[PDB]
């Protein structure tokens, strides 16, 4: 029934290059990508597209996380030197 896909984003630029909306209490219960900036790390990936709903980031689920906290997880996952990547479990729903 559900449809997930894992997109791994390599860090080829200084910026992530995405914009997200939603979280807990919002009309969009899960963070949804609205813009993908040209030149950014996300733009090089290609597979990541606008409208994709992010369920998990590096294994951590965004279900139940408020927009503020959801943004905190993604920003920290990009700033971190542990990985040279950022795993996203995204959906078409």
């Amino acid at each position: 029934e559900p449809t997930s896909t894992l997109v791994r984003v390599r860090k080829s630029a200084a910026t992530l290059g995405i914009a997200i909306e939603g979280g807990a209490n919002t009309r969009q219960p899960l963070p949804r990508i609205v813009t993908i900036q040209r030149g950014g790390s996300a733009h090089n990936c290609g597979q990541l597209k606008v409208g994709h709903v992010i369920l998990e980031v590096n294994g951590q689920t965004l279900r139940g996380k408020e927009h503020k906290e959801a943004a905190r997880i993604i920003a920290e996952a990009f700033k971190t030197k542990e990985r040279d990547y950022i795993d996203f479990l995204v959906t078409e729903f």
């Binding site: 992530l16 995405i18 919002t26 609205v34 813009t35 927009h67 943004a71 990009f78």
Partner: peptide, 8 residues
């Protein structure tokens, strides 16, 4: 009355 949007 809010409509959040975070840029990275």
């Amino acid at each position: 009355y809010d409509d959040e949007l975070t840029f990275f």
